[PDB]
Amino acid sequence: GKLVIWINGDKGYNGLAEVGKKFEKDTGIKVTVEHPDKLEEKFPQVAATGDGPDIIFWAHDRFGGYAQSGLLAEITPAAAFQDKLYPFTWDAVRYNGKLIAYPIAVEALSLIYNKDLLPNPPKTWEEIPALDKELKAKGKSALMFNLQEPYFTWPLIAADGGYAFKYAAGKYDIKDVGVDNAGAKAGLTFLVDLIKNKHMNADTDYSIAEHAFNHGETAMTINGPWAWSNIDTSAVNYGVTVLPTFKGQPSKPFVGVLSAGINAASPNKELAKEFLENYLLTDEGLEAVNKDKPLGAVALKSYEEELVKDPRVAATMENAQKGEIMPNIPQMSAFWYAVRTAVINAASGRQTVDAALAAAQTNAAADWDVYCSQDESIPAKFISRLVTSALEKTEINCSNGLVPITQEFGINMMLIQYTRNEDSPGMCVFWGPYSVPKNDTVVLYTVTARLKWSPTNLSIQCYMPKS
């Protein structure tokens, strides 16, 4: 007789907790809002265990994956309620014909700039270097944004034609991935050049960028609505405008739709539906959550019509319309990880843009996931994906030999030993140790695998500290 909700920390969870307080008051059912770290990865683990929240708040891109594991309850809202929200929202949360969650809002990255430092922000990425040299002479910096998450660097990568998945035959095609093409190479290459010229640092993350911009150290940042609140608390007067173009083309951010899924194991499903439908989604509730932190353009029409008046929301919908809606298919979980690697390594010099993006193309389509330990004593772990509906025989290439893995069904696991021979029971051990360019601290252990269908190859790699 209680509702536990999971939502990210950057989103306002305080307002949502106030909504939960309203609900508790009326019906007497307590509502607790929590914000675990890396909740999108932690949710499947515990949901398969039978634990976890009744409701989970995340962008729709992950939800398909959850729905593939039977972790999400099916949504059956009334036709009136469906009419209360825009249709494209619902369409984003539709997976295999069924509604797996409730759309709460639309998110797209935008360019937030300091008007006092930069009254006229640039309309192109190519001007960022020239600006930087100027601002660095005054003790400031042109642009700082999170390079650790690919969500923030994707607009530049996709502007020139880089794309996550190609849509063909009524579905997103997994065998066609656009991370390795000329457009992505041009965008990420431009980023790496910006890092090599010291216009940006490869270690900058979300909190570093927020601290730099909100305190007036940098003139510009790239962020979404959730950040604006903090900037309103600072002394920085900020505009929100279109992202800079790249090679004369508009930056294409991946557009998320904040959605609330219902845990399939929850006994409270009726109460979660009551709370979300008749409490959370209203002018009042969305207004509260918006007060704590902005949601961007909400899916609820009545309140949206009032939010569009906000020029920041209008800009959010401009960048959103220039971008694309993220697919919700499970493979996204792989994509975001793969790209997350390519940007980081390429930014750290660990890999060339070409190698990083090729490995990212092979990884973005994932029949396998690797868990790299931080200690050489414990082996790495290899967990295959489900592959509901191909997957004939996959041959792994290991130091001690090759390990075949054939078909079967469901989930398949294999332990990849770090470099020790233990005696020889058909086991796989890593390659290496191998050198890591520009870094003497970390060494690299790799493995390759060749997948047969009814002729592709992936490369798994684990970086580890030396001492």
Added chain:
Amino acid sequence: TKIEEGKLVIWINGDKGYNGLAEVGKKFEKDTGIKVTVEHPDKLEEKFPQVAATGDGPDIIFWAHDRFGGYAQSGLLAEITPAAAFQDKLYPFTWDAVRYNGKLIAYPIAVEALSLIYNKDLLPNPPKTWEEIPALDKELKAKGKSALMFNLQEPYFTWPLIAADGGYAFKYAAGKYDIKDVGVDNAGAKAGLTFLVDLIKNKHMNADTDYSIAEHAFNHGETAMTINGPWAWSNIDTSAVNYGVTVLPTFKGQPSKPFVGVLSAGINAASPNKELAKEFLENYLLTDEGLEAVNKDKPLGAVALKSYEEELVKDPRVAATMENAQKGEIMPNIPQMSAFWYAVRTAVINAASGRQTVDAALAAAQTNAAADWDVYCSQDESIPAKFISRLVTALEKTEINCSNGLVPITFGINMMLIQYTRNELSPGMCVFWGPYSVPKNDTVVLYTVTARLKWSEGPPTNLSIQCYMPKS
């Protein structure tokens, strides 16, 4: 990775003294400033291997050593490297319990063995033989009481009687336990289990008795005796019952052989906090002080720490625990134990339900114990059951028989989803057979599956999966 650094998360069973351990965590947090959170999930022994393979889970897990081998076979446990002086602080056989393939995979907090707890007022002399239970019950039944009530659901409680006559889990040969040799189907186990089923047939015990029913019956004075471990004593201390703790009754002139567990703490391989866990275990938890706090919350039985053990043996209850323990055997840590226990469990259940004869139940159990397979039953129908097959070194093929059909399966480890109800998620889909009725039990409903295994040498062997579910 997924585990929070700068903090220690600990998992321990609900019956254990987790509160005291959390007070130890208050001491450790005060001294080092590192918070320690103690949790007691349900089915933690089964839940740990699922989340720990993904890099999540606790930094430290508290369980009997029998499971740890499995965890170590999957690479889910870090190696333990205490100082030789520290190794000498504990009894050698404890270290041998947590030793797997030459490495120490955990710290053996305590020693656990089942004992016979009786009411002094109701029974002046505790029965020295199982064969005396049938008569006494009939007498106590006339007073509105019962002779013996103990949990029949978990095979840990029924194993002492089954093994007394020569029933054994695994044969030890050439310095190693023999996987192909199972002593569940021998004459001794048949005699013990037949005697239990005879106690049920004669209404001397109810097949539905579980930990809660037995604890409630004895602690409130409804039954004269119960079979339980040290952790239960606390509850009885809360009751008004004056209770003795003594040796288990003999069966066919032979002592009951309870499986002796060693309460141990393993360190999750994925934990970044390993150093903090080591410091905590060596310099805080294993001490007279810490084990005294945990002891006050719940009794640990005979601890592996000599300094505190020497003080515990003075307790006649601990002396009885070590009597039944030395009369029993230390549980093997090999992974196949996971298959052994389930087997016995299922068998006993069948035998008590009347679904099968003792002979059939124990033969089927013998087939179940040798395949090194596991099953995770879910408390909800939305999330399926998980049927895991581990490759130790062998099975040529395994074919499942499911409602929707049969699913054939041919390195590494393989987890398969056994579905209770078809869902939106499936070429190799396997759905449980059921639901099926449970005699005597309106609440719980069971789902079954049968799988056939071809080793490629000798006969094929079939196993049976059973998962139980509540109803409304």
